[PDB]
Amino acid sequence: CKLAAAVPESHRKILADIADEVLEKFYGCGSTLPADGSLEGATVLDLGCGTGRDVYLASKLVGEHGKVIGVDMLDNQLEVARKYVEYHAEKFFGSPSRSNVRFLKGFIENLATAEPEGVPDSSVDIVISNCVCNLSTNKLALFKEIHRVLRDGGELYFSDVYADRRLSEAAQQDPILYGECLGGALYLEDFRRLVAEAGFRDVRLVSVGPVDVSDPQLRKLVPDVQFYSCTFRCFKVATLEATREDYGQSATYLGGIGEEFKLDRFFTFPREKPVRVDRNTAEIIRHSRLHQWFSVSAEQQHMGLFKANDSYALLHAPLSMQVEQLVSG
Numbered sequence: 001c002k003l004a005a006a007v008p009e010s011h012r013k014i015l016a017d018i019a020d021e022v023l024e025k026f027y028g029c030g031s032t033l034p035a036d037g038s039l040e041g042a043t044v045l046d047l048g049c050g051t052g053r054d055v056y057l058a059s060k061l062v063g064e065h066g067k068v069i070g071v072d073m074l075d076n077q078l079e080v081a082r083k084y085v086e087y088h089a090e091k092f093f094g095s096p097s098r099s100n101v102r103f104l105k106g107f108i109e110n111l112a113t114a115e116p117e118g119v120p121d122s123s124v125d126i127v128i129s130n131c132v133c134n135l136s137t138n139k140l141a142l143f144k145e146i147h148r149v150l151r152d153g154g155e156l157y158f159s160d161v162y163a164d165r166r167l168s169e170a171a172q173q174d175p176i177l178y179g180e181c182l183g184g185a186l187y188l189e190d191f192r193r194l195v196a197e198a199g200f201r202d203v204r205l206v207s208v209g210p211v212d213v214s215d216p217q218l219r220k221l222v223p224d225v226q227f228y229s230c231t232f233r234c235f236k237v238a239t240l241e242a243t244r245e246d247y248g249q250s251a252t253y254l255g256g257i258g259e260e261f262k263l264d265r266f267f268t269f270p271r272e273k274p275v276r277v278d279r280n281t282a283e284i285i286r287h288s289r290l291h292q293w294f295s296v297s298a299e300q301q302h303m304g305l306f307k308a309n310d311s312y313a314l315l316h317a318p319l320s321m322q323v324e325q326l327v328s329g
């Protein structure tokens with residue numbers, strides 16, 4: 001995969017404990033994870049888990065009441081993943097039989113028929129993945145399958161490559177672009193309509209990096225296209241609306257999973273300081289696992305669109321203007 005991202009310090013220690021073979025043969029870049037504290041007790045599913053680097057990492061972070069599932073279709077990668085279950089149970093939880101992980105073989109677009117067992121409806125709290133979408137062009141079925149396995153309050157928390165415009169037919173047929181995850185890149189606005197068709201009505205930017213195309217033969221197929229690496233979080237929450245409405249609410253981060261909670265690029269909550277929120281963000285806080293570390297005030301009368309944020313114009317803007325402006329400048 002990419003050059004991608006720097007490994008956060010809290011993970012470094014845990015990676016030193018992970019079997020060297022799992023690390024050595026792992027395909028692609030690490031799945032990024034929500035703040036570590038927020039994972040305790042969660043059920044996490046990694047799509048495209050490979051040899052299990054991210055599954056084993058999460059295994060420790062979710063603790064013994066948490067559970068982790070990895071899914072993949074590369075036989076060679078799973079055989080490796082499957083045979084370090086005990087290794088890691090001992091090393092994390094003092095015994096070979098106390099494992100909170102499992103590995104499933106199947107296409108990520110169809111988790112219900114993955115091979116030891118399927119993933120049932122409404123059973124996962126967090127689905128993670130890094131750079132898996134641009135390799136299939138049935139993105140839609142993949143988004144609907146993630147919607148299906150998530151419980152209410154669950155999130156798809158993921159990184160992929162997107163484009164600031166629609167690639168040409170020629171760019172989408174190119175095999176070098178394809179294998180770099182560029183050629184299957186969605187236009188951000190098409191991505192937004194598509195995950196909303198799958199049921200995720202609200203997409204929050206966590207971070208964005210520029211992705212460059214340098215080879216001058218390649219650049220000719222995608223001449224003014226700007227590509228981005230975006231981490232988004234998309235919550236499955238029954239009451240989310242298409243718009244960000246002010247109902248007079250504020251939320252207060254109570255402490256206990258960091259100095260401050262960073263929900264997305266528009267909303268940071270310093271410990272014990274109330275922050276005005278739109279009702280979608282109130283509802284995410286309330287119905288997701290995050291409620292344990294927050295206090296959210298009651299809905300008042302509808303006050304119109306939410307403006308009580310210092311980037312409120314960008315907050316309401318299409319996804320490509322958010323990404324474009326938050327990348328740099």
Ligand SMILES: O=[N+]([O-])c1cc([AsH2])ccc1O
Binds near residue numbers: 001002181
């Ligand atoms: O660099 N990338 O972002 C990248 C992403 C994926 As997916 C595959 C190969 C690559 O070089």
Ligand SMILES: [Ca+2]
Binds near residue numbers: 027028029031
């Ligand atoms: Ca992976």
Ligand SMILES: [Ca+2]
Binds near residue numbers: 164226324
């Ligand atoms: Ca642009």
Ligand SMILES: [Mg+2]
Binds near residue numbers: 245249277282
């Ligand atoms: Mg409100």
Ligand code: NA
Binds near residue numbers: 060085089092
């Ligand atoms: Na384990």
